[PDB]
Design a protein around this ligand. Structure first.
Ligand SMILES: Nc1ncnc2c1ncn2[C@@H]1O[C@H](COP(=O)(O)OP(=O)(O)O)[C@@H](O)[C@H]1O
Ligand SMILES: Nc1ncnc2c1ncn2[C@@H]1O[C@H](COP(=O)(O)OP(=O)(O)O)[C@@H](O)[C@H]1O
Ligand SMILES: Nc1ncnc2c1ncn2[C@@H]1O[C@H](COP(=O)(O)OP(=O)(O)O)[C@@H](O)[C@H]1O
Lengths: 122, 374, 22, 50, 374, 373, 47
């Protein structure tokens, strides 16, 4: 991509971002090793929201409310908001974090969510 | 690893930039806006978001009421300041704030409670081990690479000048004109009413700002450009609104930044930026004016209008005695100069002593910054 | 990256399309 | 026209439909070649002006 | 208690559609018509019964006068609504309403007493433990599956347009226009008079409505279609009356829906549906319009005429700027979309918090609907 | 003596006209142009194409009614020419070729509008002289004090200007587009809540009459809502032109409350009291004390009963305690914009202000920016 | 399993392929216009 190397700012940021995404993928795969799940791509797999709920169930140690059954966008927003509400109830300070940000698939927001859940559940 | 890289955060009225010490460029650059929804949600189960910080607010402009936490270089609202600082540390950077030192920048003349509040917030809330606060126009000299010159830094908040001769800064020659880019945005909004285009809401001020950034320039000779604009229609441009409407900017392109040089358009009786620079020169001593004429440095995003360097050179050449030569040094990366020199400040080996330690804050309160910084 | 570059004055982040007027 | 056949009109419409699909295919290949050429020219100009 | 499944009931002006939550299609669809004895003589077929409700009334048209309980989305006769609801609960779904929650629909701009009387009637005469009142055009967007767009609904009683951006509805841009299928039916009677045929009574109204539902289409170009129809008899089609004679409508099959695009045929000075949608888009902010142009959603049984989508797209493309991209989303199942999204809305896990309890009604009276619902 | 000039006030809702030096306008009529809707089957009737002024208001049923001025901007110019022709030849029976003409304009608007008026009045009407003045300056003239802040509100535009000792501050001029027509549309939208339906342009006049007769500004809003919800003593009855009887009730004070809370209309702008306080605060420090005690109301929209007490209370809440607030609301304020104009054309030095015919012929229609403020 | 159902399926598949083709074509056209719009100014700046 020529536009990627067009500016010296975002090329450097994504140079860091790719390595951070690899590291976060290894970290989540270890905790998802016990459950029959795997994170092939961090952006595409978390769009559904069920898999992040399974991560929360492994990490916290207590059960979560079960996801609603559906195929449309509203159901995915519901599943993401369930996990975000559980994280909010655990007194984990999340700001500028919305369900539609995860569903649309913003890179920085997904990485920030993974970094926050790494730091606050350690 | 031993020494760890200290992150620098440049906060201004317009944009917030952040990045590590050794990097040539900031990690992340984003506007300093906090948004909140005005309407009421109607569908059950999208998800809750009380506030929008940064570029998410800029994406959803037409549904929020945008708010700026910094007014004229002073932090008016602090809860918003923890919002931007948390979004900087935990989202744009993905670093733990408690394992790094932090460098921050501020205006020269400002209330002391501002400095005390930033120190208290950086120590009590984010648990930063050390911090430092620096003047922006001092860091512009580090970015420039010379130890002798006068800096005029014009941001979105303020326009301040400072002379430094061989590493010694003269505090009585520092001037802080309150003219900036947001006033020019308001003036552009006022003069677009003449052609019939109305821009009122806070979400539409961003559109006006983009029009200002794209189709504005500083005329070399104002009255001759007035005559040319009244003669023909060669210097007319067309802008494309987000909804598909087309506007014709015409004459106003060189009437917005001309308010920098003649503040009587905005009702202020203060002198222009060129006369402010000249007065800051003449407030210094006799023997150092010759060196200061040859090292005038521009900084800040507001000085990115095309042709501003030539206009400043012509005006100062008119004011100064004719026997000396005047060169305006305007680097093509002045917008990040305040950042860039700051990065150089975090790489020096002698700077490790100047950090405000956590123990010093614990034993002396937040007023330690008035002794340690500047 | 600063420690490699001699002059940050002569530095480019983007073409910037300078000097378009006239 | 008083004398007409439904089969014939349907058949003409099928003709026009395949012509539309083919036209859109040359349109797509047309524009892909155009955008690649313009991108390469812009990149070369940017390098030499830098 | 997952066995307790709520009931989704849409009370349209022409037809009522009821079903269970979590299903793809409504179980019962029947017109809301109350038939009462004529005054010419005693009836042949009924004894102690006072009136006929539903398809039983529709079959016995020759001895009954037919009344619509909904007039322009307003419940004129509340006892008729009790009869309709009783027939729906006891004769079509065959379930006791005491054990199930009820979800209902409503037009946007209504008298405020409509919701209050609906809630009071439901709670007192059916003893439902929980209920909720929703707005139809939000349910249409739920059925379509997106959270951003403009909904232009046209039922049998009213037409209304509402924009939604990311689930926030804009109440100041909601437009309501009184143009639906009943006025089209009356105009069809008026334009079927000059061919020779005459229709007066309510049974004639049902016959004309049946003709309209099967014979009318929207012309792409009105003058070109008029010239084509005057040129030859290609467009003519035949219909069989229940008496036995065959009629031939000919020209006026595309003249009936043209009142939706030119209301001056009906004598009213309002605008068409395309102008209404464009005005509703212009009432929103500048930024979000680009989304609202791309996600125009059609709904309602009145928009079932073929050729409506291309005509509406052509008209809006004429009105809108050339740069902008316009597409019209017309689902093939749109006639029941107002029901379908309701079946979605009762299935969501958050919506269980949004029900109106029997206890809350007991303390707060019928005014709880304004605070609990939108 | 010299010929008395004609003072013509072009408002968004009504047009007023009269002779300079009089204490009252001589012709007042709505600025509405109507056109026929249905078809005429009677042969031998009138064949007039456009109804204008009070004649259009006389027959509303068979006409579509339009306003040539909306939001202080002229949108249709043929209708404006018809309005001015009916004002000159019919309402006053004067010859425009021998009378100077004074015109009235909102502070901030499109520039070209001014040129068009000049280009019309020198060309079609052949006046020897003309002038254009801002509304609020004339209102301050009719107030009788040199120093004060003027807040004006009509059917198209609300604007506040400060003037200290005859010197105006151009950077402190504030304009807001919330006006009487917005209140009429909001009253229509809120009268939909009770089941009453009004849709056509003829019914907007009915709603405007209802608003003028039965609306007042409540001193306290939440207390008034509680009072209106608790009892039915606040209801009033109105009679429709076809004999129907309607009951307004709670909608009497909710419509004017939209002037102070623009979030009712979806606008994010501030209220009129906040606009006045912000226009005061933009001025210099010294001249604020005189501006706090000399607030002047003007325009028809400020004729709601109880507007002065609410404005004084809100401004006193915003202002510091040691300053005192005086709201000046003359009882004839609806015509103040006219009356000061009738003063201004009678002055001795204003004979040196006129844009002559020769000056326009020499320097084209762009002369109006050099002479008029 | 006969020829007429195959005819209906074939023409329906062809129609939706054609519609997707104009959608992709018009989006690509607008992108092309933008790219040329950007490049021409760069050439003028070189001069
Ligand atoms: N390309 C440009 N041309 C002209 N003015 C600009 C340009 N980019 C930004 N500006 C002005 O500069 C301001 C940003 O300046 P900046 O250096 O970010 O201020 P700070 O960093 O102190 O917040 C913006 O408000 C805008 O008005
Ligand atoms: N197949 C059809 N073609 C055209 N119009 C139809 C068709 N079926 C129903 N309609 C029209 O739709 C109306 C019923 O609309 P409906 O969906 O009941 O509106 P509501 O939103 O009030 O439920 C009928 O009066 C009829 O005029
Ligand atoms: N007695 C009244 N009480 C309340 N409002 C009034 C009254 N008279 C007029 N108005 C309002 O003022 C408007 C007329 O203002 P007007 O002075 O004609 O404005 P302008 O002349 O500047 O266009 C009307 O639309 C009406 O809403």
């Amino acid at each position: 991509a020529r536009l990627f190397e067009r500016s010296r700012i975002k090329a450097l940021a994504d140079e860091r971002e790719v390595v951070q995404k690899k590291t976060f993928t290894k970290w989540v795969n270890s905790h998802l090793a016990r459950v029959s799940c795997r994170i092939t791509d961090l952006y595409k797999d978390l769009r559904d929201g069920r898999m992040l709920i399974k991560l929360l169930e492994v990490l916290s140690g207590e059960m979560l409310p079960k996801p609603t059954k559906g195929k449309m966008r509203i159901h995915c927003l519901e599943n993401v908001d369930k996990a975000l509400q559980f994280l909010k109830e655990q007194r984990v300070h999340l700001e500028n974090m919305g369900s539609h940000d995860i569903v649309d698939g913003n890179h920085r927001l997904v990485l920030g969510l993974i970094w926050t859940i790494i730091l606050r559940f350690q | 690893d031993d020494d760890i890289a200290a992150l620098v955060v440049d906060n201004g009225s317009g944009m917030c930039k952040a990045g590590f010490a050794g990097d040539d460029a900031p990690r992340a650059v984003f506007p300093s806006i906090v948004g909140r929804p005005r309407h009421q949600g109607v569908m059950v189960g999208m998800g809750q978001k009380d506030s929008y910080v940064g570029d998410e607010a800029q994406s959803k402009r037409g549904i929020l009421t945008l708010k700026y936490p910094i007014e004229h270089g002073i932090v008016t609202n602090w809860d918003d300041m923890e919002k931007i600082w948390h979004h900087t540390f935990y989202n744009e950077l993905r670093v733990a704030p408690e394992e790094h030192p932090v460098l921050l920048t501020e205006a020269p003349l400002n209330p002391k409670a501002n400095r005390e509040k930033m120190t208290q917030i950086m120590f009590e809330t984010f648990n930063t081990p050390a911090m430092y606060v620096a003047i922006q126009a001092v860091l512009s000299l580090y970015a420039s690479g010379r130890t002798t010159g006068i800096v005029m830094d014009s941001g979105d908040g303020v326009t301040h000048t400072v002379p430094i001769y061989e590493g010694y800064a003269l505090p009585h020659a520092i001037l802080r004109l309150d003219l900036a880019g947001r006033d020019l945005t308001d003036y552009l909004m006022k003069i677009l009413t003449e052609r019939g285009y109305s821009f009122t809401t806070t979400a539409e001020r961003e559109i006006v700002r983009d029009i200002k950034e794209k189709l504005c320039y500083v005329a070399l000779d104002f009255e001759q450009e007035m005559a040319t604009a009244a003669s023909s229609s060669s210097l007319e441009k067309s802008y494309e609104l987000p909804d598909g409407q087309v506007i014709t900017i015409g004459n106003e392109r060189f009437r917005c930044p001309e308010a920098l040089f003649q503040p009587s358009f905005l009702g202020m009786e203060s002198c222009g930026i060129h006369e402010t620079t000249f007065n800051s020169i003449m407030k210094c001593d006799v023997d150092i004016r010759k060196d200061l004429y040859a090292n005038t440095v521009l900084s800040g995003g507001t000085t990115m209008y095309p042709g501003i360097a030539d206009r400043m050179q012509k005006e100062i050449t008119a004011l100064a005695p004719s026997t000396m030569k005047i060169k305006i040094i305007a680097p093509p990366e002045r917008k990040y100069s305040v950042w860039i020199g700051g990065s150089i400040l975090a790489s020096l080996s002698t700077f490790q002593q100047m950090w405000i330690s956590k123990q010093e804050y614990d034993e002396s309160g937040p007023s330690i910054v008035h002794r340690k910084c500047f | 990256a600063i420690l490699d570059i001699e002059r940050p004055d002569l530095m480019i982040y983007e073409p910037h399309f300078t000097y378009s007027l006239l | 026209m008083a004398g007409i056949t439904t089969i014939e009109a349907v058949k003409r419409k099928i003709q026009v439909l395949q012509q539309q699909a083919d036209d859109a295919e040359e349109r797509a290949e047309r524009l892909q070649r155009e955008v690649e050429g313009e991108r390469r020219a812009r990149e070369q100009a940017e390098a030499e002006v830098a």
